[PDB]
């Protein structure tokens, strides 16, 4: 029974994921090799820092990357579902049924399950990108990670998504909503109530120049210069050397006439802001402040990449060539005090829609503030599943989908003749781990909420369609209450891209484990 022992090793990891999924779940401490404490709900960090040897667990780790890269939600759905399929398969392995026909039973049940997922869709989003419409998608994503911030972070995240997402339809050629399109920053002090949403990237550097802010003119021209500010020299090498004190007067006076002549043509073209990616000389700050040009320095090359997607500016390797095609446009440039430090931000009003936004977070504890940043970053990739590839449809969540699939799959088990009926019936039983997981974490009795849940989905309707309840979920409450809530009350549902993609990954994950009857290794 070496194949059974491989399942027992996953059982230790299976109990680890039972405390992950759900808002009542538990957080794990991850101690990095550098002596840093890491505590997060998402289990992909745990599997990344822990190298796996045995293949059965390693396939589940590689299957986690399949869910994590393509979607920002459902990492715990694959680990829990694939782990239970091997636990319920121990009854068939014991009886003597070979693991070959066990795989064939899941393949027939997978096609029957994916066909029923299209009929589980109740509502559909119109892609209006309204402030209230984005709350329905983001609300279940914030859940199962951070508790108590679900209502607070709903309005903060939905505001930045609508700014970076244009309104268009019937166009699939140009991709939208890049991963880097949303940046999240944090600062100590204040609270979540004082947090605001910025329409552009926030710069933490101070305005060293004498010009604090620009004027009220519309569409301020901004220039991004990679070359440092100095006298014009050769692009290749061209290092200025000092020999005698007589040449010092020519070097100082030489830089005064050249810089003033190059910056005069820039100010005449309407460019009030110059972005210098390198160091700025002392003489450069003198001429730019008299012409009203705000000095902005960005030494980090990572921030200049996302800036090109906002105003459309391009970095110039040389200096002194104000190309109009490389110039950007910004509506308003001011300097605000964030967290006690005055910094120059980047934003705009009612023009030149930006593809990059930044959310400023404020919290009392820096440890819990970092976990909120990871929960929002994980919520960004969850929005990617709303695109053209079946992002409009939705399925009932909070354990409502796994219960309905039980009566659908078990109905076809006894109907389909042959030996495949044994694996089909056990395939629907493995879905019982999802409602039991939410019941154990919430402290509810497994002998009360779980058995009474099947009575709600089983009714007698004088018709050919079971109806009158689509709303029966699993109770997530921490206080004793009679019965369970409804899906329509809290609007907690699962996306089609999350549910449908997790099934194909979970079946292939458990198939590889059942396909291995032995291992072959060599000496290192």
């Amino acid at each position: 029974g070496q194949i059974i022992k491989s399942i027992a090793a996953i059982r230790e990891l299976h109990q680890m994921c039972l405390t992950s999924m759900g808002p009542c779940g538990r957080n794990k401490i991850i101690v990095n090799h550098l002596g840093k404490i890491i505590i997060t709900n998402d289990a992909a960090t745990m599997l990344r820092e822990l190298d796996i040897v045995h293949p059965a667990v390693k396939v589940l780790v590689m299957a986690t990357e399949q869910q994590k890269i393509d979607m920002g939600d459902g990492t715990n759905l694959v680990m829990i579902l694939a782990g239970e399929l091997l636990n319920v398969s121990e009854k068939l392995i014991s009886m003597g049924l070979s693991a070959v026909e066990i795989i064939q039973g899941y393949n027939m049940a997978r096609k029957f399950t994916l066909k029923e997922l299209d009929e589980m869709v109740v509502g559909e989003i119109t892609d209006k990108n309204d402030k209230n419409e984005l709350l329905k998608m983001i609300k279940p994503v914030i859940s199962s990670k951070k508790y108590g911030s679900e209502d607070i972070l709903s309005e903060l995240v939905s505001e930045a998504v609508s700014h970076v997402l244009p309104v268009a339809q019937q166009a699939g050629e140009i991709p939208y909503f890049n991963v880097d399109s949303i940046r999240v920053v944090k600062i100590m002090g204040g609270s979540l109530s004082n947090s605001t949403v910025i329409k552009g990237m926030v710069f933490n550097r101070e305005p060293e120049g004498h010009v604090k802010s620009l004027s009220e003119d519309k569409k301020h021209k901004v220039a991004v210069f990679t070359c440092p500010l100095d006298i014009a020299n050769t692009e290749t090498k061209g290092t200025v050397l000092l020999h005698n004190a007589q040449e010092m007067l020519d070097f100082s006076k030489g830089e005064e006439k050249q810089i003033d002549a190059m910056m005069k043509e820039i100010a005449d073209m309407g460019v009030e802001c110059i972005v210098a990616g390198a160091g700025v000389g002392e003489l450069a700050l003198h001429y730019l402040n008299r012409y009203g040009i705000l000095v902005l320095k960005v030494p980090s090359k990572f921030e200049l990449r996302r800036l090109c997607r906002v105003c459309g500016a391009t970095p110039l390797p040389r200096l002194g060539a104000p190309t109009p095609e490389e110039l950007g446009l910004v509506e308003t440039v001011k300097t605000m005090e964030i967290g006690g430090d005055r910094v120059t931000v980047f934003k705009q009003e009612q023009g030149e829609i930006s593809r990059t936004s930044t959310i400023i977070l404020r919290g009392a504890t820096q440890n819990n503030l970092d976990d909120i940043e990871r929960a929002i970053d994980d919520g960004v990739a969850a929005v990617k599943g709303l695109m053209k590839p079946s992002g409009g449809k939705l399925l009932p969540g909070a354990g409502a989908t796994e219960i309905e699939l039980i009566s659908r799959i078990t109905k076809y088990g006894e109907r389909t003749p042959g030996l495949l009926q044994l694996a089909i019936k056990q395939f629907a039983v493995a879905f019982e781990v999802v409602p039991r997981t939410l019941a154990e974490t919430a402290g509810l009795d497994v002998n009360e909420v779980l058995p009474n849940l099947y009575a709600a989905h089983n009714v007698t309707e004088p018709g050919a369609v079971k109806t009158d309840h689509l709303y029966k979920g699993v109770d997530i409450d921490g206080e004793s209450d009679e019965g369970v809530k409804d899906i329509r009350e809290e609007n907690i549902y699962d996306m089609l891209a999350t549910k449908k993609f997790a099934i194909n990954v979970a079946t292939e994950a458990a198939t590889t484990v059942l396909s291995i009857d032995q291992i072959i290794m060599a000496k290192k």
Binding site: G96, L97, E414, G418, L419, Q421, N447, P451, Y454
Partner: protein, 493 residues
């Protein structure tokens, strides 16, 4: 939870040995004794009896098998497997799933009622008055035994034995007796050496092996007069021989006042009382047991009397056909013919001992038919037909009582599973097609033991009485609730 696991481990380890002892194709078992001997018999009764056990759960199954054998003659391993599989199927629920034991016990009480209803639906009527129909029933305990040649004569001895004890009556006043028959006391067999099995007849009355006090007596009596008494006739206690002979004569004269043709004395009879009653034309029988007087009073009608002077005038010799002193097998007998007496004959003592256990198991099958005119198909047909009906009723069973309920449906399939494993066929392929057969075809389709392929029982009926199926399911629920009721183990006085 440690004692709950030991209750499952001790019950399964003992039941797992006899799983291969079910069916005519059952494999043999080897039990090595500490003295160097072995047991070649595959009977589950003789195997587990010689196996010394420690945990008390195994001792509960030993007393359950002894009680079950008093009701039904066969199907001993069926009760142990059925009662042991229910506890085995509840192992993941009670232990892993953390299901409360009373919830399981409460579900077994409701499942026991539904299990008896399914058996009554699949049951078929049978005529208990047909002598030809009763031959094919008892034949299940006849074939593959030495009595197969005398089966025609064995069925006559088995049927005519229960006809005297049975009483057929019914009404709404005194209720229904349900045809109560006592095999133990009344139908108790008497093995007489010598003779022939073909000459064995069913004698209605009581039989006594004690001889007559006189060698030459009348071989037949027209109107026999039976007189029962307790105090023997002898000289009592507070020239001498004149008083002793007179005192015994006065005690015997009181009995002769009615001039009886037969004298029965419970205690011994002195030689003085034998000569006085010899000329009176009456036979004297010394040393009559006290327990026999209750059965002799029914075949005769003589009132039990203690003192010889207390004999009532109501004592008569009516309802006694004949009195025969005829000797059969070099042993003097007595024929006094609700209670009969079975007279067994043979060619040796080993033949009588083999017919003994065979006739008792033969009458146990015929007795179960008398409890109700119903039969159930054998060979795993009834066991699988119930499990199919259990899964259909689950639509109204939502709630916590449904989880332990599923352990009963999987336990009913264990009985036909052991027959397939002993047959050699694929247990996964056959049980999957057999369970789907009841959902479409009739419930009467079983499994053949000799072949091992799904076939209809129309060819070979193999019809077992309902009492075997009843007591198997009833005692299984009681045995399952017996071990689940005890969650702790404490030793010491």
């Amino acid at each position: 939870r440690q004692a709950q696991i030991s209750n499952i481990t001790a019950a399964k380890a003992v039941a797992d040995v006899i799983r291969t002892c079910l069916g005519p194709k059952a494999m043999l078992k080897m039990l090595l004794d500490p003295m160097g001997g072995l047991v070649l018999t595959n009977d589950g009764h003789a195997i587990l009896r010689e196996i010394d056990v420690a945990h008390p759960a195994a001792k509960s199954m030993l007393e359950l098998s002894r009680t079950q054998d008093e009701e039904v003659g066969d199907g001993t391993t069926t009760v142990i497997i059925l009662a042991g599989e229910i506890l085995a199927q509840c192992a993941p629920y009670l232990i892993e799933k953390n299901i409360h034991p009373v919830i399981i016990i409460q579900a077994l009480k409701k499942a026991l009622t539904d299990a008896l209803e399914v058996i009554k639906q699949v049951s078929k009527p049978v005529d208990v008055e047909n002598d030809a129909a009763m031959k094919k029933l008892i034949q299940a305990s006849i074939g593959t035994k030495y009595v197969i040649h005398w089966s025609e004569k064995m069925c006559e001895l088995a049927l005519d034995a229960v006809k005297t004890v049975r009483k057929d009556l019914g009404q709404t006043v005194e209720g229904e007796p349900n045809f109560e028959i006592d095999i133990k006391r009344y139908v108790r067999v008497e093995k007489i050496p010598g003779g022939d099995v073909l000459d064995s007849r069913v004698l209605k009355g009581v039989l006594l092996n004690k001889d007559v006090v006189h060698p030459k007596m009348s071989r037949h009596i027209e109107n026999p007069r039976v007189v029962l008494l307790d105090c023997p006739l002898e000289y009592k206690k507070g020239r001498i021989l004149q008083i002793e002979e007179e005192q015994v004569q006065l005690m015997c004269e009181q009995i002769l006042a009615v001039r009886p043709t037969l004298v029965i004395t419970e205690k011994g009879v002195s030689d003085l009382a034998q000569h006085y009653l010899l000329k009176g034309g009456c036979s004297v029988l010394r040393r009559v047991k006290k327990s026999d007087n209750n059965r002799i009073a029914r075949v005769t009608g003589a009132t039990i009397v203690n003192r010889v002077e207390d004999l009532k005038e109501s004592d008569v010799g009516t309802n006694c056909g004949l009195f025969k002193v005829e000797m059969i097998g070099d042993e003097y007998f007595s024929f006094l013919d609700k209670a009969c007496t079975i007279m067994l004959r043979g060619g040796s003592k080993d033949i009588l001992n083999e017919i003994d256990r065979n006739l008792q198991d033969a009458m146990a099958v015929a007795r179960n038919v008398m409890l109700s005119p119903s039969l159930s198909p054998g060979g795993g047909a009834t066991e699988m037909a119930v499990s199919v009906k259990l899964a259909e009723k689950a639509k109204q069973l939502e709630g916590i009582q449904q989880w332990p309920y599923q352990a009963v449906a999987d336990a009913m399939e264990c009985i036909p599973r052991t027959l397939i494993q002993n047959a050699g066929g694929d247990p996964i392929r056959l049980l999957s097609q057999l369970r789907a057969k009841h959902a479409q075809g009739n419930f009467t389709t079983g499994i053949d033991g000799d072949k091992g392929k799904i076939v209809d029982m129309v060819s070979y009926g193999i019809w077992e009485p309902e009492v075997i199926k009843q007591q198997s399911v009833k005692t299984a629920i009681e045995s399952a609730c017996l071990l689940l009721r005890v969650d702790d183990i404490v030793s010491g006085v």
